[model samples]
Target: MPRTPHLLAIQSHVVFGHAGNAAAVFPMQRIGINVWPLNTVQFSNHTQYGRWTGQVLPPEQIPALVDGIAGIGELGNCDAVLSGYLGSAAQGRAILDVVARIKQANPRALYLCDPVMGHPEKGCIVAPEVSDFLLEEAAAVADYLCPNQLELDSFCDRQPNSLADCVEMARSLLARGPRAILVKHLNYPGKAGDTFEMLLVAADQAWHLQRPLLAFPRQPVGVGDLASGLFLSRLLLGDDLRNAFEFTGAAVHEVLLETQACGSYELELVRAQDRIAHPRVRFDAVRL
Candidate 1:
């Protein structure tokens, strides 16, 4: 059998409503990549911290899990590896070690790391050492790094006050080690309007995407997770960076709107699930 391009997602797994790997894996699989899920932790549900229960896997066990996969003769078939939400600094190193081994087994494999340090408003969820490890090690090895505006500023130690500034900030992150950077949740006041804007930046160009701020009191929790999965899936399917950006953005928008209409905190995939098969809108990304 011809090996299918596989995406190895190293992240937390939620047993109830989707978040982290739970949010990403199924979508990427629906989009046609053979997704291999490596759980960093397993939770009963994401938002209900009061009821959450799970044990964090020891860092040393990570390499052994990868080795077991390799023992099955599937290591070289990996085309991409993605990581998010390290529970500790030890886990961060474990993730990086797995990525290194996968890349060595398949030189063409892409490593996309979503450094899940915390949003500025929310503050750091993980220990400081874990965030520091991500900044120092995982970011250096990631081919693509996705961070929101607040996270980007925190990661780069610069306050980006506008959309253009955010693009420049992404470039600065690329200079650190990642070849491409996607700055998500870029919220900058418009020059002549009341709406916020979002932007995507790569090595040579940037694209500004704007959406009217909604009045909905609650929005989906895993929009970024969904976006990252779609972006990586499209990229591995040979879509250029521009198409991948627009398509992933459109998908997230559709899913968010669906969630709003249903009055839910999670994506209403039942209403917008068609986007997984066929995107409903298209936007253009211009080269800078």
Candidate 2:
């Protein structure tokens, strides 16, 4: 029998609510990847507030955790490692250290990093050091980097005012170190009207898929996490970049639409979970 792909997710784990690893592990497992979680922080909930009660795991402990996994004799079997939300520069380095080890043990394993710094409008949520680490180090080792329009601006050091400008911004990110770059939650101008586009850049080709934006009364916090997990899962399953983008985008949109109709953060998983297998919206990607 063929062995299943294993995914190691390094990030935060919340007890009260979902985010980061909490948001990623389930979807990855649902998609049939064996998920290993290495948590950077154990929190009661996401630190959306100006305060939260939890200790950021010291960087030194990271290697020990990785060693613990290695002791189990499965480290070499990992197929992919995904990281999100490093709370500090120290934590970012810790995650990078683990990535390096995983690569050493399994050369074929891919690393996907989501630089969860801050929204363009929100400014840097962690600190300058954390943002600096993501731009300078983590992104350099990532096979795939997912950033929103605002995060893309910070990563590329360019403030784009338009969709075309955003594409240029994304291209600059692709020039960095990632083999593939996915820009999410993009707003671009179109002939018909303003639309949301998800841009995928891989192997010297750029693909853009646009969908009508629906106004949701309540937006969930973990939607981005969902998108990243689904995209990585699809990519690992051999979907091309464009297909991965379209599938993840349509699934997220459908979930959001259902969530909006229900007025809940729980997501309309009952109605939208099937989207993982089949997207309700049809999208055609154009290469640029």
Candidate 3:
């Protein structure tokens, strides 16, 4: 049997609803990627409900857990590392340390940093320290940087004025060390209110894709986590950047379509498992 691609996903988890690893891991697993979920925090439920219970894992415990994985000689088997929604700056550093260790064990192992700073409307939901760490430290080491429009603005300290400017800003981030910058959500002025956009920028190429933005009473959280996970999973499965980006957009739309039909706040990941693995290619990434 061909070796299954293995991913070490370090992120938050909710026992009840989807967010962070709760939103990501299952879909990646359903798509045939082996995921080792290391929860940074475990909550009774996602915080969007406005109340929740959880505990942040002590930062020191992160390295120790990776050490345990190393003791079993499985570090070399880790094909990639994906991180998101850190609890603290210290947790961010710990995640980077694990990334370094994993890369050392397997030089080809990729790191996809889902810079989880809050979107524009909400304005930086995480601590300033955590945001700084993601911008300054994590961005420099990530093989792939996944940030929404708001988080993308945080990287360069300004918002784009046009689609060209947004693509240029995304390209600028490629100089920071990541091979690609995936703008998971692009809410630009003058765009059709009913349409959503995404961008993928590599060294010499970029692709922009748009899809009909579904209407919901309230938009679901954790869409970034789901997109980041699915994108990286597709890459590990040998899809090139463009194909992976296109696939993720389509798959996420399927999930949201289900969510809209079901009238649920949380993602319909389980109900959309087949679609997760075999999404109809609805959106095309146009080269820019």
Candidate 4:
């Protein structure tokens, strides 16, 4: 509600490439939100290359950083919290503690949980126990839940064959505690990879976003992380759910396309900074 919004982002951060906060923080900053990034791990690059070098930061450090912020009485000013990959269940629990504290400091503050489980193609990356903790514990605290199709279905323990099934499953997550759910990387039935699906659901309404698939030599690693951050950034700037969802889709598609064009393994977040701030392309969310 102020002139500028504040976001507390707790995720893994890479030194050389974009993953976790490296993928998330800059875009939110580009959109004029003051992002407070807390790195859960410090890595040389993403593990998608199969050769990342770095260390998972201690989980205890998160609360120490939070206390540092609270010492200045800045915790209550945070508009939202965003979280991605955690190095361990201890790190996950630490993030949960921060989430709880942020909400307590400012009851109006929202938590956006990007349930970064293992991808369907890549298999499980994080520990099984960590995923279980996210499903059982963190999911219950999120005001908004962003999960890729694989992660969403895995959490719901269902195989959704159609868009309707996807919607049903996402809505079901609301009963677990999240007030809203964004199901990304959804597939269009009978279309396969020709088009991509993004579904958004609140208590009484749902919207479906369809964007042409940006065919690439390989799928980019941090697109989902970027999506969650940019989407929450828009919401922080006071855009409603549907608008945030659409803008997020458009901006990320632009970045993915740009990265493919340049043949860069990392997301072109810096090059596409303008697009994230003011997306030129618009993908309308069709009401369901």
TM-score of each: 0.92, 0.90, 0.98, 0.96
> What ranges in model 2 sit over 4 Å off?
49-52, 188-194, 266-271
By summed lDDT, the worst window of 10 consecutive residues in model 3 runs over: 116-125
lDDT tens per residue, model 2, 1-288: 446788888888877656787776776677677888888889887766446678778878888898998999889998888887777888788788888999999998889888787754356677888888888898889999988776787777777667678778877777777989888777444423546678887767888888876665444667677788888888778787888888888877777777787777655555556665677786788888
- Candidate 4 segments whose C-alpha is farther than 4 A from its true place: 188-191
25-54 per-residue lDDT for model 4 (tens digits): 998898888999888888888888889888
- For all candidates in order, the CA lDDT equals 0.78, 0.78, 0.91, 0.86
Q: For residue 271, what is the lDDT in candidate 1?
A: 67
Q: Give residue 89's error in model 3 in angstroms.
A: 0.9
Tens digits of per-residue lDDT for model 3, 1-288: 567899999989899989999999999999889999999889999887889997889998999999999999989999999998887898899999999999999999999999987754367888889889998899999999999988888888887888888898899999899999999999766767888899999987899999998988876989999999999999999999999999999999999989989999899999988998898757888999
Model 1 steric clash pairs: none
Q: lDDT tens string, model 1, 157-247? A: 8875666677787878877787678876775545436443456676677777665545466445676788888888889988888888888
- Write the number of the candidate with greater lDDT, choosing between 2 and 3: 3
Pick out the ten consecutive residues of candidate 2 with the lowest summed lDDT.
187-196
RMSD of 3: 1.1
lDDT of model number 2: 0.78
Which residue pairs of candidate 2 clash?
none
